[PDB]
Design a protein around this ligand. Structure first.
Ligand code: ATP
Ligand code: ATP
Ligand code: ADP
Ligand code: ADP
Ligand code: MG
Ligand code: MG
Lengths: 243, 102, 101, 146, 96, 325, 375
């Protein structure tokens, strides 16, 4: 009881070996100094640290970032669904394991093949053919980190919060490699970009472009194999549907 | 040397005073009371100190307050006002008649 | 063109020969020159060309200086700095005859 | 994601709290428990029996299904021209079931905020979970069913 | 032009026209009661009640949402009965 | 006594200070600062600070309690290299040469434009409908350039904190300004540059963006690269040729341009001896650069599907028809 | 406030006399003398101890208690002091608060709503009946329905009428339709609200009709006021744009009459195409009067130059009657160009005084601006 909490914030650029810069999360940017014992090497630009609420001195670096939303979207329990519990999709089921399972289980194989593995692939079809079921099966049987997305719930009202959520979920996948991201009903945000609209169009297209930068390039996702499904693949932006 | 140390002492004594906010006026309500807009927070009706003649406070004067009792302190230079001012508004265009020929 | 709204009809004709030369001279201050660059002869090679295009021939003479990566601004430069400028002011205009006729 | 009550100054956790969902969702649940009997519905015995065996039997028995092994039906849609009495059948089903009943119309879920409607849908389903044997009633579903 | 500048003079020398809103007519107001209620009364804050705990039913505890400000777990003043409070209820609370 | 006073003056600028942005000064001893707390304060400045360091966008440390401004704070991509070279680019040599002149020429041949004279553009924009190798060429420049590339997306600029997102733009341009030869890449300028409460805040970040671009005249070697697929949007103010003159449109690859892309990618592959790439460069289907990769990648999977090593001719058209339409 | 207007604009010592008289009075007004030669303020201003904060109030719980919100958004149940004008406090207003306990300590000058701030047009003092040439039938008719009800309701009060609630002005463009209504505002004391029908057509679903509510709300607090709907035909003619315009139109008919009361505000509408608008506008129960604006005839035109040529310096060769004969070819707005172009024309002649030839070289250029067709 006699203890006290500590403010949390993310260390920015480093000036001297006793002067640091931390943005205290949604608060201001505070010039602070490391306490005594923390390995200065660990206090990388961007790492997450805790500060005394009195002297603001850093006293412990922490596991990278936040957002129990991603925690829920990972610990979602799909139930035991063997591939045999799905019927009449042998070609597709076999196809998916070639882009979702073999690369992360046996990456060294494609080194000799030379071809780099695809990172994302999309499931499209009329309602009631087993897309979500196939995703559940993949999540149940495979032994890796699996993210389950409802494309609606990753769309929050706070300004620029949905793009941030996409960024944090991708960061969680990168930190927990190998990881699988499943985005059901991707057409919820994957819709073609309106030329004009309300804050809805603005922020939805913003989140779409955020997800795009996340998966498209310059970051060359390492083990971030991704799966999405949609009942309306037509409405998807051509940027996504790009091979 | 004594002038230097006395200057340092004055500087130290002045350092204790707080930041006194920044405020802007859209009406000189009374000869004492002057309504101000602070940034952010909201609107305030504030009396002026002994100094600063009340005729000097004009709309959008960008004044400074004191830290407590708000209170008015001084006038400060005017704002820059860069809203729009990029695609529609141009302050001083760089084209003159001699830059044209034909 | 109605009462209380507008009062005249200022016209902008295509720049004349000496007029286009002045346009060249406007941007000619910065550019260097050889031992005898006669802008007069360069001026007459683009009949009916607009104003920004006369800047364009100076503009397209720009990266022709980068075509040799040193101070070029040569008399010959403008002769082909004319060449690539006019086609953009052109091409379908040839067909347009065979099109509209 | 859980909700705790902490020290207002030292921020130490001294509480465990019920989640709470939303004002709309709390207003969404039925506490009046209307009192229409199946007898007041007339000429729909096929439809009343259909809805009753679709919903109430999993609520009461749950052993007939497991004995047969089937998964009980989970979604029942009532449709027809207005005045046929769909709302009345829903009201009677609420009347007789004794289960946790959640009533709501389509416009109650639209909202203007970016994610608000999704939050209401998710949180209403969460409340139906936390109440365990529960029934959700959507009226004029086409409002969001467009 | 002299008329114009002299009018600007008159407007300045007259001073800023008092934008004072005014109060009620003097005969009705002030009294010592104004200072009395100013010094005595509580500056109550508005909030939205939520999900009465009622774990022990003696002091049932109340969660409120001071909208734009915060959320809290609070009790009642001894003057207001628990039967006087329902869920939500738009209840106002003290400042301390 | 004077030494003791200076020791205290050092003491007042100790570690726990709060950061703010220095607006215009007022007098010799006071100035106006915008705190990271959001509000602004009228603040007296310590004499020991060199006034010439003070600039209307400088990052300045304020006293934690008194907000007294005593400090000047010394304001990328080092290991996170894109890992790609110009050779492994799908033969957009016309685009390669243009960008070479666009950004590389201003650094390695900076002194030329005085003897050369003519002033090249100050920033570029690309339309490049999806799958047109914009990011590779952007990536290619990053691995090749001697500049200090800093990557941004339009989405990072829009935050939850009111009045912090627009401020983030300055850090982008301040950091590049400090690293004189650095290059800025702001791909997905779609988001922030949409045609003009919550609506204002996003456009404020664009408004702050527009101010920073104008400051990069000559004597600032930095160049800005902006990428966007749609590009029929974006406010004409940012489209202004006076500051984003040079633009590079990436069309769908044509024959020759197509053939380089197969040859480039297949060069790393194995392929059988009977592989007929010439049929695909001749096929009428308008496949973009991304498809070429996908057309080539799927060949490996088909080979690895049947446990086979070398890809034979039959592999490609199975893949070829599988992708595209 | 404003000064009176000198009677003759012509350069003369009579104007000198008037301006020097106003100078003398302004000099007697020139504050220096008076600037040369407690309990109420001391107590209550102590009660409202500085500094003061402004808050938005939307509640009145008791005659001494209400809910008040501040700019940050927090809401407070606070007490109202005695000196606060109870009638002045209404929801949506801005209220001064005590900085310590947030007690309500007075109402404030409302200064917001920029759009309607533009909407309460100036008194239109620049327009006057003296500036209108011979619209006799229009004047008496518009006097019947607009000016007189807003000046002497006594006839309507005694005789038992409910005065007409709406007038629509129709005529070719430039006939002076807007000028007349503006002159009515100057002639009366009522505040003037002007709106052009094209502007209220709004992109969003419901703002269009909302602006209509917003206007007639604005008219009501001003009490005697005029709402001028210029070029009404954009929102009234015949028939997702289709439904909203109908919805917008119906909003007018509900504020032009409909339910509840309408107070005192009068409504004036203008258009060029009366033969196109919805019968609901032509409805002689909804709109009681429709005023005709014909093209000016010979006598009306002569007044127009007399109105417009009053300010320039003229020659003796000017024959205004000759410029009149042809037809009702041009409206007064065109004739303003006739003066303006001539003034420029005589200026181009390097003469500060205009001649008849300048008017002929003024009349022709106005004519070429006309279109061509049916040769
Ligand atoms: N091939 C299949 N084998 C077994 N069950 C199947 C198959 N296809 C569909 N089903 C059954 O139908 C349902 C599959 O639908 P699911 O929830 O997976 O999503 P969907 O209908 O493909 O689309 P979405 O959830 O995106 O709207 C499950 O209840 C499953 O039992
Ligand atoms: N079969 C029925 N038995 C008894 N009453 C009925 C029946 N059908 C309709 N009603 C009457 O209909 C009235 C209200 O109609 P109800 O809303 O139930 O029908 P509906 O067609 O579902 O309409 P809506 O979809 O518009 O709600 C009730 O008061 C009830 O008396
Ligand atoms: N010429 C090319 N050669 C090889 N791959 C290409 C080529 N053009 C495009 N690509 C593919 O597209 C990407 C290049 O970026 P791109 O997708 O065009 O960016 P954007 O679509 O965001 O403009 C690479 O990841 C690559 O797989
Ligand atoms: N009978 C008239 N008397 C005075 N001025 C007139 C007359 N007719 C037209 N005008 C001139 O035309 C202008 C008024 O134009 P108006 O017809 O009100 O515009 P609209 O056609 O848009 O209603 C005024 O500036 C005025 O100078
Ligand atoms: Mg699904
Ligand atoms: Mg119903």
């Amino acid at each position: 009881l006699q203890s006290v909490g500590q403010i949390v914030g993310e260390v920015l650029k480093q000036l001297t070996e006793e002067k640091f810069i931390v943005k205290a999360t949604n608060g201001p940017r505070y010039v602070v100094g490391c306490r005594r014992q923390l390995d200065k090497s660990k206090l990388k630009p961007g790492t997450r640290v805790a500060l005394d609420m009195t002297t603001l001195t850093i006293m412990r670096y922490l596991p990278r970032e936040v957002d129990p939303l991603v925690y829920n979207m990972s610990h979602e329990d799909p139930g035991n669904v063997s591939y045999s519990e799905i019927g009449g999709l042998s070609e597709q089921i076999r196809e998916l394991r070639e882009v979702i399972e073999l690369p992360l289980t046996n990456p060294e194989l494609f080194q000799r093949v030379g071809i780099i593995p695809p990172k994302g692939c999309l499931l499209y079809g009329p309602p009631g053919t087993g897309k979500t079921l196939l995703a559940r099966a993949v999540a149940s049987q495979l032994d890796c980190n699996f993210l389950k997305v409802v494309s609606s719930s990753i769309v929050d009202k706070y300004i620029g919060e949905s793009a941030r959520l996409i960024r944090e979920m991708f960061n969680y996948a990168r930190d927990h490699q190998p990881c699988i991201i499943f985005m059901d009903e991707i057409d919820a945000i994957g819709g073609r970009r309106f030329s004009e609209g309300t804050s809805a169009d603005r922020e939805i297209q913003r989140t779409l472009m955020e997800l795009l930068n996340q998966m498209d390039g310059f970051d060359t996702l390492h083990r971030v194999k991704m799966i999405m499904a949609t009942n309306r693949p037509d409405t998807l932006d051509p940027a996504l549907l790009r091979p | 040397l004594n002038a230097k140390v006395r200057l340092l002492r004055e500087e130290l004594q002045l350092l204790q005073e707080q930041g006194s906010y920044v405020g802007e006026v859209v009406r000189a309500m009374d000869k004492k009371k002057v309504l101000v807009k602070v940034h952010p927070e909201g609107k305030f009706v504030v009396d002026v100190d002994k100094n600063i003649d009340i005729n000097d406070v004009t709309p959008n004067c960008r004044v400074a307050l004191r830290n407590d009792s708000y209170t008015l302190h001084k006038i400060l230079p005017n704002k820059v006002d860069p809203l729009v001012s990029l695609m529609m508004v141009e302050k001083v265009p760089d084209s003159t008649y001699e830059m044209i020929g034909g | 063109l109605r009462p209380g709204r507008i009062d005249r009809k200022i016209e902008f004709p295509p720049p004349n020969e000496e007029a286009r030369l002045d346009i060249l001279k406007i941007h000619s201050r910065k550019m260097n020159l050889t031992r005898g660059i006669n802008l007069r002869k360069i001026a007459e090679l683009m009949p009916g060309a607009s104003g920004a295009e006369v800047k364009g021939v100076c503009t397209e003479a720009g990266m022709y200086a980068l075509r040799e990566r040193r101070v070029h601004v040569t008399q010959e430069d403008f002769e082909m700095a004319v060449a690539k400028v006019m086609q953009k002011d052109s091409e379908k205009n040839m067909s347009i005859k065979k099109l509209w006729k | 994601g859980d909700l705790v009550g902490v020290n207002k100054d030292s921020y130490l956790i001294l509480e465990t709290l019920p989640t709470e969902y939303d004002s709309r969702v709390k207003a969404m649940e039925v506490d009046e428990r209307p009192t229409e009997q199946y007898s007041d519905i007339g000429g729909l015995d096929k439809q009343i029996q259909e809805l009753v065996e679709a919903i109430v039997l999993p609520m009461n028995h749950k052993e007939k299904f497991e004995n047969l092994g089937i998964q009980p039906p989970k979604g029942v849609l009532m449709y027809g021209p207005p005045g046929t009495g769909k709302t009345l059948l829903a009201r009677a089903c609420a009347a007789q079931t004794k289960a946790t009943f959640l009533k709501l119309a389509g416009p109650q879920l639209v909202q203007m905020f970016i994610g608000d409607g999704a939050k209401l849908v998710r949180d209403a389903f969460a409340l139906a979970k936390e109440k365990a044997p529960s029934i959700i009633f959507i009226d004029e579903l086409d409002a969001i069913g467009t | 032009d002299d008329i114009q500048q002299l009018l600007k003079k008159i407007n300045e020398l007259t001073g800023i026209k008092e934008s004072d809103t005014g109060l009620a007519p003097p005969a009705l107001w002030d009294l010592a009661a104004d200072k009395q209620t100013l010094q005595s009364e509580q500056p109550l804050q508005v909030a939205r009640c939520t999900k009465i705990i009622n774990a022990d039913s003696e002091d049932p505890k109340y969660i409120i949402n001071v909208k734009q400000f915060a959320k809290f777990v609070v009790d009642l003043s001894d003057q207001v009965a628990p039967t006087d409070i329902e869920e939500g209820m738009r209840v106002g609370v003290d400042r301390n | 006594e004077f030494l003791h006073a200076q020791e205290e003056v050092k003491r007042i600028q100790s570690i726990p200070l709060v950061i703010g942005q220095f607006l215009e000064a007022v007098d010799q001893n006071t100035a106006i600062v915008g705190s990271t707390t959001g509000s602004n304060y009228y603040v007296r400045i310590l004499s020991t600070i060199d006034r010439e360091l003070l600039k209307p966008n400088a990052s300045v440390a304020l006293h934690k309690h008194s907000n007294a401004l005593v400090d000047v704070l010394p304001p990328l991509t080092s290991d996170q290299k894109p890992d790609v070279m110009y050779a492994d680019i799908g033969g957009m040599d016309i685009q390669k040469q243009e960008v070479r002149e666009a950004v590389e020429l201003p650094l390695t041949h900076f002194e030329l434009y005085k003897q050369i004279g003519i002033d090249p553009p100050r920033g570029v924009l690309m339309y490049g409908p999806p799958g047109c190798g914009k990011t590779m060429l952007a990536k290619a420049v990053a691995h090749h350039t001697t500049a200090a590339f800093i990557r941004v997306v339009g989405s990072e600029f829009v935050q939850k904190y009111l009045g912090e997102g627009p401020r983030m733009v300055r850090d982008v341009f301040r950091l590049a300004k400090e690293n004189a030869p650095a290059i800025i890449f702001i791909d997905e300028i779609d988001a922030i540059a949409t045609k003009r409460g919550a609506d204002r805040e996003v456009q404020r970040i664009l408004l702050e963006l527009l101010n920073q671009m104008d400051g990069f005249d000559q004597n600032v070697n930095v160049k800005v690269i902006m990428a966007t697929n749609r590009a029929d949007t974006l406010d004409p103010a940012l489209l202004r040729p006076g500051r984003l003159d040079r633009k590079i449109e990436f069309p769908l690859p044509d024959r020759r341009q197509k053939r380089l892309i197969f040859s480039t990618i297949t060069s790393k592959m194995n392929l059988s001896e009977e592989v007929d790439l010439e049929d695909y460069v001749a096929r009428p289907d308008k496949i973009s650069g991304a498809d070429i990769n996908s057309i080539c990648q799927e060949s490996g999977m088909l080979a690895v599907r049947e446990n086979r090593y070398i890809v034979l001719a039959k592999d490609f058209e199975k893949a070829y028809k599988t992708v595209i339409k | 406030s404003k000064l009176p207007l000198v009677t003759p604009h012509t350069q003369c010592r009579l104007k000198l006399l008037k301006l020097e008289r106003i100078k003398d009075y302004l000099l007697m007004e020139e504050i220096r003398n008076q600037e040369q030669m407690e309990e109420e303020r001391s107590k209550v201003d102590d009660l409202r101890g500085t500094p003061m904060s402004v808050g938005t109030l939307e509640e009145i719980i008791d005659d001494n208690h209400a809910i008040v919100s501040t700019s940050v958004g927090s809401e407070h149940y606070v007490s109202i002091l005695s000196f606060v004008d109870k009638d002045l406090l209404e929801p949506g207003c801005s209220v001064l608060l005590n900085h310590k306990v947030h007690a309500v300590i007075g109402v404030l000058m409302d200064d917001t709503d920029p759009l309607v701030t533009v909407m309460k047009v100036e008194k239109a003092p620049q327009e006057t009946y003296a500036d209108i040439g011979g619209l006799d039938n229009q004047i008496q008719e518009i006097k019947e329905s607009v000016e007189l009800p807003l000046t002497h309701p006594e006839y309507y009060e005694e005789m038992g009428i409910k005065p007409p609630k709406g007038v629509i002005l129709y005529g070719p463009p430039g006939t002076g339709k807007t000028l007349l209504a503006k002159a009515v505002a100057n002639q009366t004391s009522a505040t003037f609200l002007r709106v052009v029908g094209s502007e209220l057509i709004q992109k969003y679903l419901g703002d269009g009709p909302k602006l209509v509510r917003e206007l007639f709300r604005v008219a009501e607090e001003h009490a005697p006021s005029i709402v001028f709907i210029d070029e009404i035909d954009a929102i009234g003619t015949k028939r997702g744009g289709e439904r909203e315009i109908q919805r917008t139109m119906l909003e007018l008919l509900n504020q032009l009459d409909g339910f509840d009361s309408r107070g005192d505000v009068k409504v004036i509408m203008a258009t060029n195409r009366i033969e196109t608008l919805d019968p609901a506008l032509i409805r002689p129960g909804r709109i009681d009067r429709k005023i005709e604006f014909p093209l000016p005839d010979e006598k009306t035109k002569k007044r127009i130059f007399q109105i417009h040529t009053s300010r320039m310096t003229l020659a003796d060769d000017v024959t205004l009657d000759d410029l009149i004969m042809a037809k009702d070819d041009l409206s007064g707005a065109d004739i303003k160009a006739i003066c303006t172009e001539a003034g420029l024309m005589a200026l181009r002649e390097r003469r500060m005084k205009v001649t008849n030839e300048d008017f002929k070289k003024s009349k022709e250029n106005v004519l070429y601006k006309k279109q061509e067709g049916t040769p």
